[PDB]
Amino acid sequence: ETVPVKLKPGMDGPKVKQWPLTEEKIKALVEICTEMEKEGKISKIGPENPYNTPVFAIKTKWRKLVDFRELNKRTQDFWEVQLGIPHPAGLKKNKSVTVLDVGDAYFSVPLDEDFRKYTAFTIPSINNETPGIRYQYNVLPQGWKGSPAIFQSSMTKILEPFRKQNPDIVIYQYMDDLYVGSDLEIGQHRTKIEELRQHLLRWGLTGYELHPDKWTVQPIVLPEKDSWTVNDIQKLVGKLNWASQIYPGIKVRQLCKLLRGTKALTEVIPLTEEAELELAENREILKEPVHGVYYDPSKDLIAEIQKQGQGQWTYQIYQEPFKNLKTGKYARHTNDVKQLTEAVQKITTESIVIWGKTPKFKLPIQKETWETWWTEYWQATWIPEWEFVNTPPLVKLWYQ
Amino acid sequence: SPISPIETVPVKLKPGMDGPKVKQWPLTEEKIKALVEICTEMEKEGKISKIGPENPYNTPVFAIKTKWRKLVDFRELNKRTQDFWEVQLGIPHPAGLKKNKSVTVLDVGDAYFSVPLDEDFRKYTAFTIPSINNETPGIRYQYNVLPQGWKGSPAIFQSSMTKILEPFRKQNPDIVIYQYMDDLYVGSDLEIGQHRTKIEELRQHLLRWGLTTPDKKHQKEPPFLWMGYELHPDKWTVQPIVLPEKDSWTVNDIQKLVGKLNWASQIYPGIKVRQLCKLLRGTKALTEVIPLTEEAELELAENREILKEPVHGVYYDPSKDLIAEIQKQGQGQWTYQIYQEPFKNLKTGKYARMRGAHTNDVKQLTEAVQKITTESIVIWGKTPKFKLPIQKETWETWWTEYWQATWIPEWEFVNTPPLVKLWYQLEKEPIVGAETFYVDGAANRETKLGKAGYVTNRGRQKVVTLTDTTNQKTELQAIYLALQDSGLEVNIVTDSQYALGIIQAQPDQSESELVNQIIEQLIKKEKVYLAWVPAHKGIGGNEQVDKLVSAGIR
Ligand SMILES: NCc1cc(Cl)cc(Oc2c(Cl)ccc3c2nnn3Cc2[nH]nc3ncccc23)c1Cl
């Protein structure tokens, strides 16, 4: 018995263009889809289905990735409020969190007949030889936020003996993945994951290891200097001027005093003691969390990334600009696009662990280069929302 | 003519909408007679069927002229019919075609009329031949087949042709079949005999499903004229391009010239269109004569020379890699050629784009690489190997220091001048024994009057008044002043992120003449260090320029 799925009123299904795919990805998808069809998971469709969702291939085995971003936004009432999955606050406090792919579970649950048309996707051909190969889903699709929402009840039943036997193990389902946390020693943790895989293995379903307790802030670092130049104080005042827009209690009055008259940039200007007091007092505030900043569940999360050079990237997560919920850094035969996708995926997984939702990314790359290359390195089964931004020149050095 | 026994495509109207009920306008006797003759003939062929008066839907009919044709106005029905999936997401490019031993063109005869319409949807296609004047009830018909001018026809036909071709495709994987509108383009590497036989097997499989195709004597011979292209057995080209000789060029003639040159640009290398396009800038009428500028005349002449002798492209060999070569032509103009075997181009193209107001050759080159990469994935399903007029060192220096994630796939330097370079570079640290200029600009929002100036550590000073200005313009003007009065080495301190931002990206070309003047200065300089400070915080020299430029302004 299929659960009926109703779209958000006033808006209809997704009509998103399929991106050009290489020959190897097309052939990989044709092979996958021929197989799913024989198994009745998907069916070939007619032209009377005007809907479309993009499809991609990722990795040694090729796997299908359906971009349900638009369908998910259009079904938000269903998966978020109607059939919401509660996020545990304890997960971010665990010594180890193991991420397990549980997407194969969804293929055993039939999709509501009157919702299937909205899961439409096309396999394109090279040089437009043939019209695309069109399919729709007959079962809960991987990548659609409604799939874990519907499967919720079956997941609870599967995990019930395990949860009863392990009361201090946190299990969170987000999209196609299970997040399993414990404060156990690494060996005992890995032993309990194998036990859970055995439980999953009895219902069909078949890792990636995080350490959230070791996740720490990227404080705005103020230099430690032997001798300070006019240029160094100027760099320091701008950096402090901006940190004061986010942190309660920052002061620059004493440091600003030093900058009197029109001086040469290289002039070594001997420091004071009250200026030294400011530095140390600001340093103290900079290492601690931001006072008065709390996550609002009704608001979207934003992630900002800056290229810092030498394979280093900085990022900030916020809901209101300046108001940082989390800051961090990512460090690397790796290119900028490969480094950027790795950072996006790392920031998303931390965001899932901490808030139970993905951020919208502000990416310092050209829309087109990102659109051509992102899949070459993408490894997750989810895709966050993203925008293309032109990184302001000073945000970079203030986060350096 | 047959009507395919294929399964019908279920069609629906848009939710909350009923079929059309649009009144038939009284027709002339000659029009009524013409329609009656047309309709009785289509009814006998199975195309339409007579209906009772119980059906409340109606679409208007018209007839136009020794033969007459029936025009059905499906505008109302089309507005009420559901949306269909897009027919094709692109059109095949000749350069993506592989060379086959034999290829034949099969056009399907009376395509839409050869495929049935959803029985439950036929009622909405109802039309009336009016009787002479008001008088008596009209003759009523509904369609049994896909009507011409109906929304769903292109999609339903294509979908029907796909379901039909399916079993034939499975049992013949070494046969290429292109689906284009009501045509089939069929290619194989079999010797004449078994190709002619496979064509007959195809034709016969098609007739079993209601579709008629031409036979050996009626089927077209190469070169195939198709979509402005010429497809020969060993090469392809664009159809003849004739650039008119005119005494006076109108907007319409220039627009037609640009379209022709753009079309030729796919296979003829070096085609330029920048100077011809510039003429189309402004509020100018279709028939308004535009005098050709010197540059437009020069560009026209260069193009006539390129087009003088015929140029062809070759077909794709899937075993070889694709090589893409790019050259800088000038004023934001780039040109490229794609080949597999040195100098036998599969295709050519051009790139010219203003991606912002301020740019450089390094950014333009990456934009052209991305545009070519996209195109290769569409045409060939693979990215090409690039040969670029930029040194690995220039690229490495640029990618490393730029704020944006930028990447070029597998490439090699090729010494084809003009080479792509960075014209200047900003210092990383303040210069010792160089004058520090503190710059500022201020502009009054009501009067649009502004001031640009500088105070130095060497006690120097200047203030210039500006008339129809903006804060941004004054801040850039202030940087220009400092650059003009400094000599070989400078340290500049601005409170403008906007100005800092532009200069840091190392532009070499701009839409702003002021930015171009700043550029021509930066190039001349030996060393420039540019720094930023927050405004109105009482910072050193910044507070001093602020008072100077603010006087009589803010
Ligand atoms: N209707 C245009 C048309 C458009 C499209 Cl997009 C495809 C078409 O059909 C071809 C096929 Cl099926 C295969 C190779 C082709 C084709 N066309 N050119 N070449 C390369 C080629 N190989 N061998 C040839 N022999 C003769 C002519 C071209 C030849 C046709 Cl005719």
Side-chain angles (χ1 to χ4, degrees), chain B residues 250-265:
Chain B
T250 74
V251 165
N252 174 64
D253 302 324
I254 302 168
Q255 284 174 180
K256 284 160 91 199
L257 218 202
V258 173
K260 281 177 175 188
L261 287 172
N262 284 340
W263 188 258
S265 82

Side-chain angles (χ1 to χ4, degrees), chain A residues 139-280:
Chain A
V139 294
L140 297 186
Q142 289 159 124
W144 176 51
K145 285 177 184 173
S147 297
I150 288 154
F151 199 77
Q152 214 179 152
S153 50
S154 302
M155 191 58 83
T156 299
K157 141 196 85 68
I158 298 165
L159 300 168
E160 182 266 291
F162 192 83
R163 284 183 156 132
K164 201 223 103 241
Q165 291 161 229
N166 307 96
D168 307 324
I169 289 173
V170 177
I171 308 173
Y172 178 53
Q173 185 178 203
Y174 186 87
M175 295 191 61
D176 304 346
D177 308 290
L178 233 45
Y179 287 81
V180 197
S182 81
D183 300 324
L184 292 166
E185 183 273 322
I186 196 57
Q188 302 180 280
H189 181 83
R190 302 204 267 233
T191 299
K192 290 288 165 176
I193 299 308
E194 192 37 66
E195 191 169 318
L196 211 224
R197 289 205 194 90
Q198 295 308 325
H199 288 269
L200 270 6
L201 185 75
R202 269 51 165 192
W203 271 273
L205 40 162
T206 310
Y208 175 48
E209 229 165 72
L210 308 164
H211 300 291
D213 80 315
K214 291 212 167 197
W215 294 351
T216 52
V217 286
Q218 185 54 39
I220 292 137
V221 180
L222 307 173
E224 252 121 15
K225 279 180 169 72
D226 338 69
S227 62
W228 295 86
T229 235
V230 165
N231 181 259
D232 302 331
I233 297 148
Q234 286 183 167
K235 282 171 69 73
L236 199 256
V237 303
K239 193 166 186 185
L240 282 174
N241 142 254
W242 154 95
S244 70
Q245 282 165 315
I246 128 159
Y247 291 97
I250 305 288
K251 272 285 163 286
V252 73
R253 210 57 53 105
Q254 292 301 141
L255 256 308
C256 279
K257 280 185 172 186
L258 286 133
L259 300 159
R260 274 174 78 257
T262 110
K263 305 194 280 266
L265 284 200
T266 48
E267 198 184 297
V268 175
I269 84 139
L271 257 274
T272 74
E273 65 300 80
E274 290 147 314
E276 252 86 348
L277 243 116
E278 272 201 337
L279 272 160

